[PDB]
Amino acid sequence: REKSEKFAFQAEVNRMMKLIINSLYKNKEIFLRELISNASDALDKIRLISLTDENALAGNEELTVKIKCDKEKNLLHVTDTGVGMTREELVKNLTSELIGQFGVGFYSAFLVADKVIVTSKHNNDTQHIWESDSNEFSVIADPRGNTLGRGTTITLVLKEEASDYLELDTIKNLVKKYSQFINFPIYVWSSKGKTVWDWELMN
Numbered sequence: 001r002e003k004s005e006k007f008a009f010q011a012e013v014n015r016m017m018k019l020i021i022n023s024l025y026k027n028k029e030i031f032l033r034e035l036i037s038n039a040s041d042a043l044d045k046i047r048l049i050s051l052t053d054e055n056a057l058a059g060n061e062e063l064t065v066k067i068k069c070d071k072e073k074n075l076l077h078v079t080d081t082g083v084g085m086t087r088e089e090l091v092k093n094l095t096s097e098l099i100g101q102f103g104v105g106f107y108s109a110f111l112v113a114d115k116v117i118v119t120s121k122h123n124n125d126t127q128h129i130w131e132s133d134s135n136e137f138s139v140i141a142d143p144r145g146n147t148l149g150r151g152t153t154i155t156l157v158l159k160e161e162a163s164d165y166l167e168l169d170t171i172k173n174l175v176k177k178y179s180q181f182i183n184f185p186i187y188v189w190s191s192k193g194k195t196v197w198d199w200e201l202m203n
């Protein structure tokens with residue numbers, strides 16, 4: 001149950017990190033923008049798919065991004081109800097503008113994170129967890145089953161120096177500033193809370 005779960009990045013794939021991390025060392029807060037763009041792209045996809053597929057939205061009828069800081073656990077979560085990724089996509093998918101050009105903006109998460117977890121659910125596959133420290137990565141079936149319904153959560157284990165991204169004022173100011181790639185609603189969990197009115201619509 002390891003040779004089918006533990007993998008390592010391609011030599012070009014690992015080299016691409018050396019470009020992203022070294023180049024954007026002064027603009028670390030670009031990561032939220034990049035993650036939010038991907039969420040919007042994945043929302044565009046399932047929305048386009050839903051034009052031709054009347055069952056496309058069955059597992060989650062909502063088209064949103066929801067951001068929530070878990071300061072107690074040192075975690076930042078970015079959750080979209082987009083197209084999601086299959087296991088095959090999680091396994092095989094491997095300068096502020098150039099990052100968005102070649103599609104590698106996702107790995108700007110490692111400017112602020114020691115470890116990135118991706119939980120995704122695609123309509124044609126079970127829910128899976130991908131995790132990496134940017135040296136190796138693994139992909140496993142999610143033991144919690146289908147909790148997302150459809151879409152993708154990006155979970156960031158923040159570095160000690162990135163503590164500020166667990167703060168509500170910081171993440172809210174960043175989301176408003178980087179509402180570049182969103183014509184879908186973006187919410188921030190505005191609580192540390194019990195109800196659905198605890199989401200603040202950011203855009």
Ligand SMILES: CC(C)NCCCn1c(Sc2cc3c(cc2I)OCO3)nc2c(N)ncnc21
Pocket residue numbers: 038039042080082083084085089090093094103104105106107118130151152
């Ligand atoms: C070929 C296809 C799978 N690539 C499109 C972008 C992949 N992707 C991305 S970027 C990404 C995500 C990864 C990844 C590499 C990238 I680049 O390895 C672990 O999870 N974010 C997405 C999201 N929120 N929803 C759906 N798909 C997402």
Ligand SMILES: [Ca+2]
Pocket residue numbers: 123124125
């Ligand atoms: Ca299905």
